[PDB]
A paper describes a structure:
Here, we produced γH2A.X using a hybrid chemical approach and assembled nucleosomes with either H2A, H2A.X, γH2A.X or mutants of H2A or H2A.X as the incorporated H2A variant. Nucleosome stability/dynamics investigations and crystallographic structure characterization were carried out in combination with surface plasmon resonance (SPR)- and bio-layer interferometry (BLI)-based techniques to measure the kinetics of PARP1 association with and dissociation from the DSB constructs (represented by the blunt-end DNA termini; Homo sapiens histone and PARP proteins). Additionally, enzymatic assays were performed to shed light on the catalytic parameters of PARylation. This reveals that PARP1 recognition of and activation by DSBs is modulated by histone variant composition and post-translational modification status.
To obtain well-diffracting crystals of γH2A.X-NCP, we designed a cohesive-end DNA fragment (147s) consisting of a 143 bp core with 4-nucleotide 3′ overhangs at each terminus. In order to shed light on the basis for the variant-specific differences in PARP1 nucleosome association, we sought to obtain well-diffracting crystals with NCP, which required screening of different DNA constructs. While H2A and H2A.X nucleosomes display very similar susceptibility towards digestion, that of the γH2A.X nucleosome is significantly higher, in particular for the earliest digest time points in which the nucleosome core DNA termini are initially degraded. The enhanced activation by γH2A.X nucleosome holds even relative to the corresponding 167 bp naked DNA, in spite of the availability of multiple PARP1 binding sites on the latter.
Author numbering:
A (entry chain H): 26 to 121
B (entry chain A): 38 to 135
C (entry chain G), G (entry chain C): 13 to 122
D (entry chain B): 23 to 102
E (entry chain E): 38 to 134
F (entry chain F): 16 to 102
H (entry chain D): 26 to 122
DNA sequence: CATATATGCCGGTCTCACACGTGCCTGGAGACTAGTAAGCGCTTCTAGTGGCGGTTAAAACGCGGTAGACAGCGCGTACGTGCGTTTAAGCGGTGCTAGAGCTGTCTACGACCAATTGAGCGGCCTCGGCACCGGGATATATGGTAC
DNA sequence: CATATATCCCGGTGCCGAGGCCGCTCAATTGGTCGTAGACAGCTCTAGCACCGCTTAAACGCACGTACGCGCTGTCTACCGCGTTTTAACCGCCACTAGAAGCGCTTACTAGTCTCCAGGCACGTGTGAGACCGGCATATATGGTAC
């Protein structure tokens, strides 16, 4: 036939679901809401980041912009943690 | 005979429908209205079944929201009964109406 | 030879896919190496934070599989996720049970 | 007679109940049909406008989603 | 001795301020409050006077907008006097919570 | 090397008269006595949100001075777009 | 030659400048030749449409010069501009004169 | 010295102003509000154009995208007039070059 | 108190969507190269800060009284319930085919280049529009009064 | 009707901000090159549509009557208007320097290019989570009647 290919975050939602709730599953509909959710927040952070870069006459979106973005975008507590897990993964990645 | 006092079933229905997540408008009457309104913008139009669902999900959500805000406006005027004027105040303050 | 940057950063979320989407998405002329790592990290966190509470909402409901309601209940009962998804509609989610006190019957025996 | 009336008194009641409304005025039902129509009009107008641009004759869920987004009523679980 | 009836000057004032565009909060008090609030987020901040003017413009615009919506809620309750509960419903239906 | 006057209770510089004037432009005729503290409360929440965002923009730009542009971007973010200060 | 692409389209608005701002603007890999012409035309139209109503307001106020109040009057009294700029604050615009009926003094034989 | 070069739409606003109202001028602040207006609507159209391209896996914002953008973004009679004025300038440009 | 009923729950039954193992294939990840964005030195000088005193407009306070908030009443009917009746939604169905959308060829068009030049900018100079003011013409609200 | 008190509207006056001349210079225009996006047409077969006839469930209409909206009244005090006194904003000036904004040097960063290698996919399965549900248990609303 023709096959056709359409990506998603479906795998990565499951890998995270097994970390936090190892014996719990998720309907396809609910997977769609998680998928909508990820793409949305991606668009938001990327966007804010995009503007941060532009406002400062800089051609690169660095982890810095992604952070300042997250700080503007996420509410008080959610932002604190976000900035932890983000800085952590950046630090872990450069050392390896 | 037996009769529930007026207000009691209404509260049961509030409890009932707040519990559930099923769509509360019948699908086909809705699907006909979507096609009807769509015709007035582009003719000979076809709808993915999913697109009609999406519209109906977003419509019911929007209206259920609006009734929440309509209810607060009614309570504000020391009433228990929602009235057109409540929907109008809600919509005016929301920014939808002028 | 060859191991995913996802692992280097200790992430389930695809750092590489994200780097692509940042470049492909016309957000800026260029995208730093940390940007997709950092972003993927935040995305994974929020995914966990929602799934954590949504998983809970399922147990409380005596169900092993998360349905949309569990995600709604999770998001609308958490102050900070509810602000983040203030302008969002979760299909097949319903609403939090919440009758206004003035609407409840007389009951003056307390 | 019209399709809008297919949105029945009892349907609108159910919607109100999920909204937490105990008592409903007789005039509400027509008012709500007016509000619902303006909502669908504004949304569908944009959805079709997206369809037109894709040179399609079928309105997709992706049209409605991008349309609902534009109007600030972002929907999750239809391809956001 | 001459004396206007309660509400005659109020209407007069409504007309006076709805004709004009001058800022209605005094400049120095507003600035002290901007510095005070900014200082609590970060110490040793300076402000371009335009950033204060922009902040005052945005604040009064917001508050005049909110008194309108408040007033409609007051009137909705068959009243003519705005009350905290009016402000609170306006802000709730706006989604400011 | 110079003492800056410690800033305290400046929300009270948003006086009763000024709040009343604001209500007048809003076509408010009669005002409860409880409105002026209620109002100060709301103003303060508003100003904190814009200034949080404004200062975030400044900190990112590695500046110590808050600019009119910083306020304008902050305001745009919050959905309260403002003409007449650049951008 | 060197003749402004503005002139080729019969526009006052700078088609070339707009072509730059579209490319430099993190908008898409490629920008057509039509896009900036079409865009500069719509910007020029809307500019004229409000400068007409704002000039009229200025002349009604016995003034040579358009000031923000004039733009505010122009914009808020026009149904379609008011909706376009529904979420916009015009510094030094003020508000439209509007007093709800129930606040106006009774017993007026005017 | 000799302050850096800052662009502005203020040259074309005066041009259209003289077209429409030849004996009418414009204040600094008014011109400022006009600049913010042009920058704002530019960004709105350019963004909705950027999304239309992307939603349809196109690498190019054409006049056709600007057009659809303008349909989505301007209200009724303003869109109709804008589209026509837009289409015209394209057509006129297409033949000139 | 007792009686009526709606809802909740159990344990069993079934079914179909989930969550798994299996290709298979494309979209990335190890090098690798090569030019630019931006970091970081140094300099200029803009405009942000802080302080003082003369003037006076705005703020604050207290007084007095009115008109609006509120609560209690009582009247009328617009509702909510529940019933018996009608209607059409939902469904499982068997076609039927527009068109979504995939692949493969071929311009047309848009980016990139990198010397050439006038559109647009920052200065600078300067009047004419308008801010501000006081004099006089109304316009209205309030209150004196005659009927 | 009479009068007191704001507001409007007028020219007159003086300041300074709009707007117009200038000369310098970037970013936009030319015109030639080259890579590929997308236009166009064919083909496939996904999934949208539509006529059918049951079977209920949900809509409908009706009729009862009750709790609630709504207009009236009367109380009372909170909020308005105003005169006096208090206060601190505003203005216009100082003097001081932080840091914003801009320039030139310089290099790690990233993008662009190949090659490869497994990560993510569409497929196909079979089976266990949950939908359904009969009938049984529990909670709660409702009215009777004797205090
Ligand atoms: Cl980075
Ligand atoms: Cl084009
Ligand atoms: K400075
Ligand atoms: K199809
Ligand atoms: Mn402090
Ligand atoms: Mn007992
Ligand atoms: Mn008992
Ligand atoms: Mn069970
Ligand atoms: Mn299995
Ligand atoms: Mn540079
Ligand atoms: Mn002093
Ligand atoms: Mn008293
Ligand atoms: Mn009382
Ligand atoms: Mn040129
Ligand atoms: Mn020139
Ligand atoms: Mn003059
Ligand atoms: Mn005067
Ligand atoms: Mn009188
Ligand atoms: Mn008489
Ligand atoms: Mn005059
Ligand atoms: Mn192609
Ligand atoms: Mn009856
Ligand atoms: Mn009545
Ligand atoms: Mn320094
Ligand atoms: Mn799969
Ligand atoms: Mn059952
Ligand atoms: Mn009882």
């Amino acid at each position: 036939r023709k096959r056709s290919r359409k990506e998603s975050y479906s795998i990565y939602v499951y890998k995270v679901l097994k970390q936090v709730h190892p014996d719990t599953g998720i309907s396809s509909k609910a997977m769609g809401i998680m998928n909508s959710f990820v793409n949305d927040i991606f668009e938001r952070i990327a966007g804010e980041a995009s503007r941060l870069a532009h406002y400062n006459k800089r051609s690169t979106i660095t982890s810095r912009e992604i952070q300042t973005a997250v700080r503007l975008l996420l509410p008080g507590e959610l932002a604190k943690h976000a900035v932890s897990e983000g800085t952590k993964a950046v630090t872990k990645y450069t050392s390896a | 005979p037996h009769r529930y006092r007026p207000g009691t079933v209404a509260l049961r229905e509030i409890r009932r429908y707040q519990k559930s997540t099923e769509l509360l408008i019948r699908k086909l009457p809705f699907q006909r209205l979507v096609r009807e309104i769509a015709q007035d913008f582009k003719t000979d139009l076809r709808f993915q079944s999913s697109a009609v669902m999406a519209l109906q999900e977003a419509c019911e959500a929007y209206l259920v929201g609006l009734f929440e805000d309509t209810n607060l406006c009614a309570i504000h005027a020391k009433r228990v009964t929602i009235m057109p004027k409540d929907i109008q105040l809600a919509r005016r303050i929301r920014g939808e109406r002028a | 030879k060859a191991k995913s940057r996802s692992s280097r950063a200790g992430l389930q979320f695809p750092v590489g896919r994200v780097h692509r989407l940042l470049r492909k998405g016309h957000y800026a002329e260029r995208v730093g190496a940390g940007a997709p790592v950092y972003l993927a990290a935040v995305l994974e966190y929020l995914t966990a934070e929602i799934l954590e509470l949504a998983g809970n909402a399922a147990r409380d409901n005596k169900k092993t599989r998360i349905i949309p309601r569990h995600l709604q209940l999770a998001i609308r009962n958490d102050e900070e996720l509810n602000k983040l998804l203030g302008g969002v509609t979760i299909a097949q989610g319903g609403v939090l049970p919440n009758i206004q006190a003035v609407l409840l019957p007389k009951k003056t025996s307390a | 007679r019209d399709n809008i009336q297919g949105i029945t008194k009892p349907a609108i009641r159910r919607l109100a109940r999920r909204g937490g409304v105990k008592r409903i005025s007789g005039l509400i039902y027509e008012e709500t049909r007016g509000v619902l129509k303006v909502f669908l009009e504004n949304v569908i107008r944009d959805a079709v406008t997206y369809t037109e641009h894709a040179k399609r004759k079928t309105v997709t869920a992706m049209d409605v989603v991008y349309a609902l987004k534009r109007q600030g009523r972002t929907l999750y679980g239809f391809g956001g």
